[PDB]
Design an enzyme around this catalytic site. Structure first.
Site, PDB file in Angstrom:
ATOM      1  N   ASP A   1      -8.661  11.249  10.568  1.00 47.33           N
ATOM      2  CA  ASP A   1      -8.759  10.625   9.245  1.00 47.33           C
ATOM      3  C   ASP A   1      -9.527   9.314   9.254  1.00 47.33           C
ATOM      4  O   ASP A   1      -9.066   8.304   8.760  1.00 47.33           O
ATOM      5  CB  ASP A   1      -7.387  10.484   8.560  1.00 47.33           C
ATOM      6  CG  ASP A   1      -7.504  10.441   7.008  1.00 47.33           C
ATOM      7  OD1 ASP A   1      -8.607  10.749   6.489  1.00 47.33           O
ATOM      8  OD2 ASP A   1      -6.522  10.026   6.353  1.00 47.33           O
ATOM      9  N   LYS A  16       6.844   0.301   6.839  1.00 42.79           N
ATOM     10  CA  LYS A  16       6.559   1.598   6.211  1.00 42.79           C
ATOM     11  C   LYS A  16       7.882   2.308   6.031  1.00 42.79           C
ATOM     12  O   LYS A  16       8.735   2.285   6.925  1.00 42.79           O
ATOM     13  CB  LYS A  16       5.649   2.462   7.079  1.00 42.79           C
ATOM     14  CG  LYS A  16       5.263   3.786   6.386  1.00 42.79           C
ATOM     15  CD  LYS A  16       4.039   4.383   7.027  1.00 42.79           C
ATOM     16  CE  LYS A  16       3.603   5.656   6.319  1.00 42.79           C
ATOM     17  NZ  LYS A  16       2.264   6.169   6.760  1.00 42.79           N
ATOM     18  N   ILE A  30       4.024   1.151   2.118  1.00 38.14           N
ATOM     19  CA  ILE A  30       3.929  -0.009   3.016  1.00 38.14           C
ATOM     20  C   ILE A  30       4.303  -1.269   2.254  1.00 38.14           C
ATOM     21  O   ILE A  30       3.750  -1.546   1.201  1.00 38.14           O
ATOM     22  CB  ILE A  30       2.476  -0.211   3.521  1.00 38.14           C
ATOM     23  CG1 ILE A  30       1.914   1.089   4.112  1.00 38.14           C
ATOM     24  CG2 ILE A  30       2.431  -1.337   4.570  1.00 38.14           C
ATOM     25  CD1 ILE A  30       2.707   1.654   5.277  1.00 38.14           C
ATOM     26  N   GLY A  74       0.786  -1.197   0.000  1.00 38.71           N
ATOM     27  CA  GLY A  74       0.000   0.000   0.000  1.00 38.71           C
ATOM     28  C   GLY A  74       0.815   1.242   0.000  1.00 38.71           C
ATOM     29  O   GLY A  74       2.022   1.202   0.214  1.00 38.71           O
ATOM     30  N   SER A  75       0.117   2.335  -0.270  1.00 38.21           N
ATOM     31  CA  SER A  75       0.688   3.659  -0.250  1.00 38.21           C
ATOM     32  C   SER A  75      -0.370   4.634   0.318  1.00 38.21           C
ATOM     33  O   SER A  75      -1.380   4.891  -0.320  1.00 38.21           O
ATOM     34  CB  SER A  75       1.147   4.032  -1.669  1.00 38.21           C
ATOM     35  OG  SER A  75       1.716   5.338  -1.660  1.00 38.21           O
ATOM     36  N   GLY A  76      -0.148   5.130   1.534  1.00 36.38           N
ATOM     37  CA  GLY A  76      -1.098   6.017   2.198  1.00 36.38           C
ATOM     38  C   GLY A  76      -0.803   7.446   1.827  1.00 36.38           C
ATOM     39  O   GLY A  76      -0.180   7.703   0.815  1.00 36.38           O
ATOM     40  N   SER A  77      -1.173   8.381   2.683  1.00 32.42           N
ATOM     41  CA  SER A  77      -0.921   9.790   2.377  1.00 32.42           C
ATOM     42  C   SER A  77       0.571  10.170   2.338  1.00 32.42           C
ATOM     43  O   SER A  77       0.924  11.116   1.630  1.00 32.42           O
ATOM     44  CB  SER A  77      -1.700  10.709   3.324  1.00 32.42           C
ATOM     45  OG  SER A  77      -1.180  10.602   4.608  1.00 32.42           O
ATOM     46  N   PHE A  78       1.436   9.450   3.074  1.00 29.54           N
ATOM     47  CA  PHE A  78       2.911   9.557   2.868  1.00 29.54           C
ATOM     48  C   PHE A  78       3.595   8.198   2.998  1.00 29.54           C
ATOM     49  O   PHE A  78       3.129   7.316   3.720  1.00 29.54           O
ATOM     50  CB  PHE A  78       3.571  10.586   3.836  1.00 29.54           C
ATOM     51  CG  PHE A  78       3.709  10.085   5.254  1.00 29.54           C
ATOM     52  CD1 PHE A  78       2.645  10.220   6.153  1.00 29.54           C
ATOM     53  CD2 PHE A  78       4.884   9.475   5.693  1.00 29.54           C
ATOM     54  CE1 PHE A  78       2.740   9.732   7.459  1.00 29.54           C
ATOM     55  CE2 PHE A  78       4.991   8.983   6.995  1.00 29.54           C
ATOM     56  CZ  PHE A  78       3.905   9.135   7.887  1.00 29.54           C
ATOM     57  N   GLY A  79       4.730   8.046   2.330  1.00 30.65           N
ATOM     58  CA  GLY A  79       5.497   6.816   2.408  1.00 30.65           C
ATOM     59  C   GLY A  79       4.878   5.650   1.651  1.00 30.65           C
ATOM     60  O   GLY A  79       4.001   5.831   0.821  1.00 30.65           O
TER      61      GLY A  79
HETATM   62  N1  LIG Z   1      -0.021  -2.965   9.728  1.00 32.36           N
HETATM   63  C1  LIG Z   1      -0.491  -3.164   8.479  1.00 32.36           C
HETATM   64  N2  LIG Z   1      -0.736  -4.425   7.989  1.00 32.36           N
HETATM   65  C2  LIG Z   1      -1.239  -4.569   6.766  1.00 32.36           C
HETATM   66  N3  LIG Z   1      -1.471  -3.548   5.899  1.00 32.36           N
HETATM   67  C3  LIG Z   1      -1.247  -2.293   6.243  1.00 32.36           C
HETATM   68  C4  LIG Z   1      -0.734  -2.034   7.591  1.00 32.36           C
HETATM   69  N4  LIG Z   1      -0.580  -0.710   7.678  1.00 32.36           N
HETATM   70  C5  LIG Z   1      -0.988  -0.163   6.530  1.00 32.36           C
HETATM   71  N5  LIG Z   1      -1.383  -1.123   5.642  1.00 32.36           N
HETATM   72  C6  LIG Z   1      -1.899  -0.887   4.299  1.00 32.36           C
HETATM   73  O1  LIG Z   1      -1.343   0.249   3.650  1.00 32.36           O
HETATM   74  C7  LIG Z   1      -2.304   1.264   3.396  1.00 32.36           C
HETATM   75  C8  LIG Z   1      -1.648   2.603   3.729  1.00 32.36           C
HETATM   76  O2  LIG Z   1      -1.148   2.606   5.075  1.00 32.36           O
HETATM   77  P1  LIG Z   1      -0.913   3.991   5.874  1.00 32.36           P
HETATM   78  O3  LIG Z   1      -2.043   4.869   5.509  1.00 32.36           O
HETATM   79  O4  LIG Z   1       0.371   4.611   5.477  1.00 32.36           O
HETATM   80  O5  LIG Z   1      -0.872   3.303   7.347  1.00 32.36           O
HETATM   81  P2  LIG Z   1       0.020   3.648   8.665  1.00 32.36           P
HETATM   82  O6  LIG Z   1       0.199   5.121   8.492  1.00 32.36           O
HETATM   83  O7  LIG Z   1      -0.747   3.126   9.820  1.00 32.36           O
HETATM   84  O8  LIG Z   1       1.275   2.871   8.388  1.00 32.36           O
HETATM   85  C9  LIG Z   1      -3.489   0.926   4.276  1.00 32.36           C
HETATM   86  O9  LIG Z   1      -4.747   1.322   3.751  1.00 32.36           O
HETATM   87  C10 LIG Z   1      -3.391  -0.577   4.395  1.00 32.36           C
HETATM   88  O10 LIG Z   1      -4.021  -1.229   3.293  1.00 32.36           O
END
Ligand SMILES: Nc1ncnc2c1ncn2[C@@H]1O[C@H](COP(=O)(O)OP(=O)(O)O)[C@@H](O)[C@H]1O
Length: 290
Positions: A126, A36, A21, A14-19
């Site tokens: 959020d 992350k 995963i 995955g890719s959230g608002s920054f960085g």
């Molecule tokens: N601990 C985790 N285990 C599995 N998938 C994750 C986890 N953390 C994040 N992800 C996946 O990555 C996406 C982006 O994560 P993010 O928004 O950056 O989470 P965090 O900021 O908690 O690390 C999430 O919607 C999810 O699908």
């Protein structure tokens, strides 16, 4: 594909608002983990800040365990307990249709997660389906909350003195789920997380929200169109066709004063009594489990 001598990366998940995963292996522990990574060239460093908040949250039900934070090569690193799919993923897998039973099973837990964060002095900011993940294995029935990247303190840890009622000029988190207070430029407090969850619940019931998919040129005109459509859609129109508890929920959260301690128990009970009146039981059999 290494992160020091410590982790191997398997793939991006995955890719959230920054960085980003990655699913990875914790070599020492012999277990899979979520890693992350934030590039150290960032001129807006966030990961270390998010890691400290996750540290402060540790121990709560449905809070992922933080394993390690540091820097390795070109990245800042935060390693977390690996979780299952997000509710957004599961909802799309279910073709954006959840049963009332699944919506209520999810509500009960989501309210408690938000409560917990508030017990630790933070507003999440959020609240959205992407930020709730099911556990793995035996913890497959437990909803976890993630993404502390926008989380902000609302009271003093010692005194519990609430922050003052004040403006906030940024629409920080996701506009689709933002509170009306947020659209009006008011600092988010405990009520606003709960109102957002109300929109998430109604999104689960409808498949989409009426302010979703409005086109605009500027990113600020999109926010303005969402804001207008949200303010022009009464709770009673939005929730038409679903149990009244969804409306009661939203009205209760919009009626909270800025510094009010929400009655989370009342809100869980609203949905629990509905759930029992429908003849459901809290067996954690979700729609994706059938
Ligand atoms: N601990 C985790 N285990 C599995 N998938 C994750 C986890 N953390 C994040 N992800 C996946 O990555 C996406 C982006 O994560 P993010 O928004 O950056 O989470 P965090 O900021 O908690 O690390 C999430 O919607 C999810 O699908």
């Amino acid at each position: 594909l290494r992160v020091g001598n410590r982790y191997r990366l398997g793939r991006k998940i995955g890719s959230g608002s920054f960085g980003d995963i990655y699913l990875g292996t914790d070599i020492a522990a012999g277990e899979e983990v979520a890693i992350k990574l934030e590039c150290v060239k960032t001129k807006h460093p966030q990961l270390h800040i998010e890691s400290k908040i996750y540290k402060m949250m540790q121990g709560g039900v449905g809070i992922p365990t933080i394993r390690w934070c540091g820097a390795e090569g070109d990245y800042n690193v935060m390693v977390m307990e690996l979780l299952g799919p997000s509710l957004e993923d599961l909802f799309n897998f279910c073709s954006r249709k959840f049963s009332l039973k699944t919506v209520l099973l999810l509500a009960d837990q989501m309210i408690s997660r938000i409560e917990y964060i508030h017990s630790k002095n933070f507003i999440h900011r959020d609240v959205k389906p992407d930020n709730f993940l099911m556990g793995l294995g035996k913890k497959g029935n437990l909803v976890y909350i993630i993404d502390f990247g926008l989380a902000k303190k609302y009271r003093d840890a010692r005194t519990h003195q609430h922050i003052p009622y004040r403006e906030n000029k940024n629409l920080t988190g996701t506009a689709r789920y933002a509170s009306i207070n947020t659209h009006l430029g008011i600092e988010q407090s405990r009520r606003d997380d709960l109102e957002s969850l109300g929109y998430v619940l109604m999104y689960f019931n409808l498949g989409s929200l009426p302010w979703q998919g409005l086109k605009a040129a500027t990113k600020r005109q999109k926010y303005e169109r969402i804001s207008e459509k949200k303010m022009s859609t009464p709770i009673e129109v939005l929730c038409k066709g679903y149990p009244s508890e969804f409306a009661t929920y939203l009205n209760f959260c919009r009626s909270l004063r800025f510094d009010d301690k929400p009655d989370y128990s009342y809100l869980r009970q609203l949905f629990r009594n509905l759930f029992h009146r429908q003849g459901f039981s809290y067996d954690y059999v979700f729609d994706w489990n059938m």
